[PDB]
């Protein structure tokens, strides 16, 4: 019993962690194989990050302007090129530690480990979901970037995010693998800003099913609704329509509790327009959304990773 | 920017986790140099574990009835002990993989990471508090004992902790790498509850300067006080006497921020008996205290881990 906020093991990734510096920038990389990836803004001055044209100031690198640091030992550059938002560096050695390993782009509402780095060290792991708008609500300091994200699937580790930067309000924005952002933004230092949130339901439901399987049922009431209904009432509170392919996969959660998904709607359209008047649901007085059906199942029946 | 619950990088101590069986009971052990650590109960059956004889039951074992596994591979059991309330089985193979480490018994206050496993293999990873009643509010079903807490230190593992069991409100309860149980607790299957907890202050006061350095300020009233009188007020709300050693090691949090500890335990005076009406602090509904001073400096100043 209990639930937690769960990160997944971050040793695959761990192993896979260098510095990367050029000129006088450093920051993180990803050593996989015989590659690094890295944000291309390593190249950059902080002059530079005002407005920069990566295609010229990678133009005057060369690869011996690149030092990678693998703990002590230097890792010799022999290639670059950029791919979108990213630097890939050819190294003369393949990572004995590479796990075996995918570039998956993920879609708001999934959630992944974040493992923060500074200078190619580990300092700490925690969850994130990317949300709605293309951030992430994360804790990146000045030397985080190239720090990455990444879901574990039994043996494989599936990356799926590396940190680039912040935007007013303390949220965080960043790339897939292949040098993608999330959202609308760019690797420039110019005033941007996320998009208004909105609350992806389908994570706030598969809490709820949490609650209930760790016996906090106090909201649960005697009602349905449709899926029509329950949509309307949930639109003025900022929260995501719900899909059938949401219902679908709230299906085990659904089965395994004996609580039919609109019913739970019921329950929740009931806390929207109620309030949850002084009360908590797992040690929570705000409403979660940062749990997804699978993170919940995972986490209710002790999903392991080789 | 950005404060998040954030654990340890788990690598160094998934390095350490092998499965250990006896008769029919499987859990988790730990690993280290040529010892193997687990919870004593692996000798029991369920019924045995209603009222147990442990020493009665490990006289009638012998070295090969406990199976050892690292992965595909068993290690073959040449010793075994017991010490408190955890066996120590001595292996035939030194863990390669053994991170420089130490065993402590940490303080009512203090926090750390637990790496959830079963069968051997980790879950996730997440961060506790030892709460003043010796629980801790974990995230643990059936397998997960022998799951382990830790600290890193640059390169050191400091363990503190070892899974044995969930009371009644499901809070968890364990012991140290020594086998003593944190509280009052024995490893029986008989009616035991927790003493009722009280609010670790001084975290709260690192919590919120967490908050200001983050730049959630609106707190903040214009007043002092006396460690004496804020001490009365915070009794009432079952909160913890703030000591001036906790003064102490709240300095370089207040030196940091140029807000000494009275200024902000006037502060926290007011929360507490105003409430927060209808505001958050840093996301959070609730004042937070699972996170140490320490663990507001590593995270807002970027420590990291070789
Ligand atoms: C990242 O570049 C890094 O860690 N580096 C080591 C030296 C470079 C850094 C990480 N940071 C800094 C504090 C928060 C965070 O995530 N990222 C950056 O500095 C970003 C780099 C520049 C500007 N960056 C920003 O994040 C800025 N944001 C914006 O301009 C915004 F409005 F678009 F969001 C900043 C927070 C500095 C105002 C580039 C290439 C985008
Ligand atoms: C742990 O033994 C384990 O995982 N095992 C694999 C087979 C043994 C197990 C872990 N669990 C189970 C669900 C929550 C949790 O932490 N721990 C135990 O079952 C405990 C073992 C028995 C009884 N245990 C309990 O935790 C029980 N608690 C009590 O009796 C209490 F009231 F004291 F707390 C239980 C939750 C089963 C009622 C021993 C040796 C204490
Ligand atoms: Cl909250």
């Given at each position: 019993?209990?639930?937690?906020?769960?990160?997944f093991?971050?040793?695959?990734?761990?192993?896979?962690?260098?510095?990367?510096?050029?000129?006088?920038?450093?920051?993180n990389?990803?050593?996989?194989?015989?590659?690094?990836?890295?944000?291309?803004?390593?190249?950059?001055?902080?002059?530079?990050?005002?407005?920069?044209?990566?295609?010229?100031?990678?133009?005057?690198?060369?690869?011996?302007?690149?030092?990678?640091?693998?703990?002590?030992?230097?890792?010799?550059?022999?290639?670059?090129?950029?791919?979108?938002?990213?630097?890939?560096?050819?190294?003369?050695?393949?990572?004995?530690?590479?796990?075996?390993?995918?570039?998956?782009?993920?879609?708001?509402?999934?959630?992944?480990?974040?493992?923060?780095?500074?200078?190619?060290?580990?300092?700490?792991?925690?969850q994130?979901?990317?949300?709605?708008?293309?951030?992430?609500?994360?804790?990146?300091?000045?030397?985080?970037?190239?720090?990455?994200?990444?879901?574990?699937?039994?043996?494989?580790?599936?990356?799926?995010?590396?940190?680039?930067?912040?935007?007013?309000?303390?949220?965080?924005?960043?790339?897939?693998?292949?040098?993608?952002?999330?959202?609308?933004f760019?690797?420039?230092?110019?005033?941007?800003?996320?998009?208004?949130?909105?609350?992806?339901?389908?994570?706030?439901?598969?809490?709820?099913?949490?609650?209930?399987?760790?016996?906090?049922?106090?909201?649960?009431?005697?009602?349905?609704?449709?899926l029509?209904?329950?949509?309307?009432?949930?639109?003025?509170?900022?929260?995501?329509?719900?899909?059938?392919?949401?219902?679908?996969?709230?299906?085990?959660?659904?089965?395994?509790?004996?609580?039919?998904?609109?019913?739970?709607?019921?329950?929740?359209?009931?806390?929207?327009?109620?309030?949850?008047?002084?009360?908590?649901?797992?040690?929570?007085?705000?409403?979660?959304?940062?749990?997804?059906?699978?993170?919940?199942?995972?986490?209710?029946?002790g999903?392991?990773?080789?």
């Amino acid at each position: 019993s209990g639930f937690r906020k769960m990160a997944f093991p971050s040793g695959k990734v761990e192993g896979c962690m260098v510095q990367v510096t050029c000129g006088t920038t450093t920051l993180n990389g990803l050593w996989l194989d015989d590659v690094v990836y890295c944000p291309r803004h390593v190249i950059c001055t902080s002059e530079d990050m005002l407005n920069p044209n990566y295609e010229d100031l990678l133009i005057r690198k060369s690869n011996h302007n690149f030092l990678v640091q693998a703990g002590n030992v230097q890792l010799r550059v022999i290639g670059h090129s950029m791919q979108n938002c990213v630097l890939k560096l050819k190294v003369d050695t393949a990572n004995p530690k590479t796990p075996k390993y995918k570039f998956v782009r993920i879609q708001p509402g999934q959630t992944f480990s974040v493992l923060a780095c500074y200078n190619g060290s580990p300092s700490g792991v925690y969850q994130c979901a990317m949300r709605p708008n293309f951030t992430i609500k994360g804790s990146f300091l000045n030397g985080s970037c190239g720090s990455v994200g990444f879901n574990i699937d039994y043996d494989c580790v599936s990356f799926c995010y590396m940190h680039h930067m912040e935007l007013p309000t303390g949220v965080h924005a960043g790339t897939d693998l292949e040098g993608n952002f999330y959202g609308p933004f760019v690797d420039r230092q110019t005033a941007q800003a996320a998009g208004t949130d909105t609350t992806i339901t389908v994570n706030v439901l598969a809490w709820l099913y949490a609650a209930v399987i760790n016996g906090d049922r106090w909201f649960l009431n005697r009602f349905t609704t449709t899926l029509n209904d329950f949509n309307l009432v949930a639109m003025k509170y900022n929260y995501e329509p719900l899909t059938q392919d949401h219902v679908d996969i709230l299906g085990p959660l659904s089965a395994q509790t004996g609580i039919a998904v609109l019913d739970m709607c019921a329950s929740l359209k009931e806390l929207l327009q109620n309030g949850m008047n002084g009360r908590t649901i797992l040690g929570s007085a705000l409403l979660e959304d940062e749990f997804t059906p699978f993170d919940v199942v995972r986490q209710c029946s002790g999903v392991t990773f080789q």
